[PDB]
Design a protein around this ligand. Structure first.
Ligand SMILES: Nc1ncnc2c1ncn2[C@@H]1O[C@H](COP(=O)(O)OP(=O)(O)O)[C@@H](O)[C@H]1O
Lengths: 182, 52
């Protein structure tokens, strides 16, 4: 647990997350994996063959980049699993799955099966007590504070403009194109 | 000198020896750049359990 859970923002290119009650997502990092390509000549060197985070943002030309989420849709689910595990790390979480009523976002206009598979992971595999996932615009309604609005959020690989009214948008007044500067 | 007495050919004064008068790196301190030291044992200790 009955303490600070984590708010997790998506991103096909950069995923975000952070401990609740704060004002900045405590940990933000891109949505890909870095795996090298050279012979382990000198033993005892950088080994593990899978880098995410500082080594990924460090050993740029030393790895092999692979984004698991495309057009805001994850297809390399196992890579996102490992990315979640990077979030679970001692550098980031230092917790277990059974410790918080964690939060997560999800942009609309998506098949439920994605969310279903994520639920299967975070509930069958991870024994998360409570993991909520919502849209990606009420968050902005809280930030702006206003009730009536037209929320636009330029995602990592998505764009979607939706007019909401007091946290109740039309289930039809929804505009979206999965695109960005990529 | 047994045999020498029988020798009609004997004359001294000059020895039988040929001996006259007797009369008896920047690739280390190159100020250009820097280098390494030997340190064998502690380098292995440094690389102690750095195996496969
Ligand atoms: N300073 C910047 N200038 C121009 N484009 C940027 C800048 N920072 C981020 N972007 C672009 O905006 C996107 C940021 O997406 P983000 O809103 O984090 O995605 P999501 O909402 O899906 O998590 C990236 O694709 C990036 O190219």
């Amino acid at each position: 647990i009955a303490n600070q859970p984590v708010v997790i923002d998506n991103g096909s290119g950069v995923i975000k997350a952070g401990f609740a009650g704060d004002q900045i997502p405590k940990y933000c990092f891109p949505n890909y994996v870095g795996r090298p390509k050279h012979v382990r000549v000198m033993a005892g060197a950088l080994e593990g063959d899978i880098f995410i985070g500082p080594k990924a943002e460090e050993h740029r030309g030393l790895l092999s980049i692979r984004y698991p989420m495309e057009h805001g849709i994850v297809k390399d689910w196992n890579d996102m699993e490992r990315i979640w595990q990077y979030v679970y790390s001692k550098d980031q979480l230092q917790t277990f799955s059974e410790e918080h009523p964690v939060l997560l976002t999800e942009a609309p206009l998506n098949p439920r099966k994605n969310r279903e598979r994520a639920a299967e992971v975070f509930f069958e595999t991870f024994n998360v007590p409570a993991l909520f996932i919502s849209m990606q615009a009420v968050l902005s309604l809280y930030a702006t504070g206003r009730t009536t609005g037209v929320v636009l959020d330029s995602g990592d690989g998505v764009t979607h403009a939706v007019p909401i009214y007091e946290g109740f948008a039309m289930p039809h007044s929804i505009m979206r194109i999965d695109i960005a500067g990529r | 000198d047994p045999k020498y007495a029988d020798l009609p050919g004997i004359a001294r004064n000059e020895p039988d020896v040929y001996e006259t008068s007797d009369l008896p790196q920047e690739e280390l301190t190159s100020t250009s750049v820097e280098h390494i030291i030997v340190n064998p044992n502690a380098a292995y200790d440094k690389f102690k359990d750095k195996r496969v």
